[PDB]
């Protein structure tokens with residue numbers, strides 16, 4: 001129902017260190033991750049979506065079909081594998097990442113001209129907000 005396509009620049013990033021710590025990311029990697037302001041480059045055609053999380057250190061690329069569970073390879077983040085499902089909850093996207101860590105997933109939605117992302121794991125919540133450049 002909503003087209004997320006766009007190049008979205010980071011405005012807000014709250015509790016990212018704590019989120020990474022809960023994924024057992026080591027001190028050195030967390031240190032460099034502190035230097036980052038990752039952006040989102042999204043291309044969508046209906047339920048087919050590509051979400052590229054772009055940073056000067058490393059990118060993380062998702063390419064999936066909404067509604068279809070898949071094996072997600074989190075190489076570059078925590079190098080884990082999850083059984084992951086992204087679903088439409090109205091105009092919002094809900095992602096559950098089944099695997100080692102409890103409560104791992106995210107929710108993505110647009111409010112006005114802002115892209116909102118809430119990342120979760122083990123009760124930790126990281127809030128990110130992005131905007132296209134007008």
Ligand SMILES: CCCCCCCCCCCCCCCC(=O)O
Nearest residue numbers: 033038051053055058060076077108
């Ligand atoms: C570990 C340092 C690398 C950090 C650079 C990439 C940041 C990725 C953050 C975790 C994965 C984000 C998943 C994106 C989901 C979404 O945007 O809908």
